[PDB]
Design a protein around this ligand. Structure first.
Ligand code: HEM
Ligand code: Y7R
Ligand code: NH4
Length: 423
């Protein structure tokens, strides 16, 4: 990066009185402050109740109980009957009438959840998976090679040229989406991901129109595969069946919309954060680059722990709960701070060390476990592995050259711009 930081440096002590999770100012602070704040919560107030971020002039919603300890987050995850994912998994849903439209299975509880997830899982047939794995390698290889051909100067923004496009190109390939439609899908996806960001001034009207357009695209794509079988995920989604239940084109479209967010910005930020850490801790980059295949599993897992691309997921209590002697009421919101669990001193030795050999690594960046456990976790690990493999092969000395431009977000640990250079 630019800022010298010794591997293993703990975050500053942040006094409890200085932590305001309900403050947009809090989420704009650097990671050192945020990590130190969650370190304080874990030690002094591991379960605590916060108001949601108020966007002045817009409805804010009711507050939430922050779970900051790995054990609590794991417990909440493994009890979806108490900690519901319906109505939604963000602190405050700005379009609650569209919660299932954008959320597909992630906003569902059982039995609806298990039915949808089972049928979707069935669609990942060996032939479809093999195509996905080939796509991961091909797209990573192509995007890194193109970075080189597009930048004779040896510098680029990792996010725009690689971390951003790779996950979405992979989702497009698995849905069987023609190369010519990539620009449209990219534009729609970026408007959706960009909505609400201070700098991307997209209005709600454009956001809705884009949201319906990409849904209509996906329904049309699904409908085409009902007549024209192909070896893509879309066809296997239309053909998959569990206990006689099949997916409508509308349900497939909502799952696609989930993927272009949940399968996309997450992996993007894992990659960018992994690049930043491998840049800040060059001994870890040397270790991995010296034994790439042998260390890939622990290196990737450590990148996910380190990045925690999903900062939190929200649950809603169906029943009163008591735990760490803290009474939480039925109907209360609960938030699972993976960013905090992934630094929990009770679970990880040397939590502040980015260690590509880390083992064990019970990181919950894909969630605490249980029913909603990241459907694409293995795909994400593969994308991470392969993209760093292609960087190792084509530009082994690539390094971040500047601190990243951070996404202002409570939900996504986002990097907007990560300058890199290579020789
Ligand atoms: C580094 C990248 C990723 C991270 C950190 C991440 C994280 C997560 C998290 C935290 C959840 C909620 C887990 C829970 O509530 O217990 C989730 C769900 C999900 N993810 Fe991922 N994810 C990533 C990549 C992907 C990819 C590549 C896919 C592509 C298939 C994907 C598909 C999904 C789906 C479909 C769900 C909802 C599963 C359900 O509700 O049952 N994810 N992800
Ligand atoms: C702004 C936007 O993204 O679309 C509207 C979505 C809303 C208002 C709810 C947001 C929740 C999701 C999109 C599920 C995403 C899951 C992961 C990233 C892991
Ligand atoms: N604030």
């Amino acid at each position: 990066g630019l800022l010298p930081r010794v591997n293993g440096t703990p975050p500053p002590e942040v006094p409890l009185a200085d932590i305001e999770l309900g403050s947009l100012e809090f989420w704009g602070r650097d990671d050192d402050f945020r990590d130190g704040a969650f370190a304080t919560l874990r030690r002094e107030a591991p379960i605590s109740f916060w108001p949601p971020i108020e966007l002045a002039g817009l409805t804010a919603g009711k507050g939430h109980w922050a779970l900051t300890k790995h054990d609590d987050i794991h417990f909440a995850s493994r009890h979806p009957e108490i900690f519901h994912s319906s109505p939604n998994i963000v602190i405050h849903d700005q379009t609650p009438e569209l919660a299932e439209y954008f959320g597909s299975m992630i906003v569902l509880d059982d039995p609806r959840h298990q039915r949808l997830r089972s049928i979707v899982s069935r669609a990942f047939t060996p032939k479809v998976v093999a195509r996905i794995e080939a796509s991961v390698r091909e797209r990573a290889h192509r995007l890194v090679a193109a970075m080189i051909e597009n930048h004779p100067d040896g510098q680029a923004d990792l996010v725009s040229e690689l971390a951003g496009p790779l996950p979405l190109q992979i989702i497009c390939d698995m849905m069987g989406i023609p190369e010519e439609d990539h620009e449209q899908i990219f534009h729609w996806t970026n408007v959706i991901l960009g909505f609400g960001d201070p700098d991307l001034t997209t209005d709600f009207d454009e956001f809705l129109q884009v949201s319906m357009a990409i849904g209509g695209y996906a329904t049309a794509l699904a409908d085409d595969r009902r007549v024209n079988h192909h070896g893509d995920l879309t066809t296997s989604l239309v053909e998959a069946e569990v206990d006689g239940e099949r997916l409508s084109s509308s349900e497939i479209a909502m799952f696609f919309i989930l993927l272009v967010v949940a399968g996309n910005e997450t992996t993007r930020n894992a990659i960018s954060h992994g690049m930043l850490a491998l840049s800040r801790y060059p001994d870890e980059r040397a270790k991995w680059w010296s034994d790439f295949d042998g260390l890939a599993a622990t290196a990737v897992e450590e990148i996910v722990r380190w990045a925690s691309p999903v900062v939190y997921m929200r649950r809603t209590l169906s029943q009163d709960v008591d735990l760490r002697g803290t009474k939480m009421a039925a109907g209360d919101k609960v938030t699972l701070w993976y960013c905090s669990a992934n630094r929990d001193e009770e679970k990880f030795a040397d939590p502040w060390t980015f260690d590509v050999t880390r083992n064990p690594n019970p990181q919950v960046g894909f969630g605490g476990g249980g029913a909603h456990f990241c459907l694409g976790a293995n795909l994400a690990r593969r994308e991470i592995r392969v993209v760093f493999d292609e960087l190792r092969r084509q530009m082994p000395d690539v390094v971040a050259t500047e601190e990243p431009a951070r996404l202002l977000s409570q939900f996504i640990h986002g990097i907007k711009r990560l300058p890199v250079a290579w020789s």
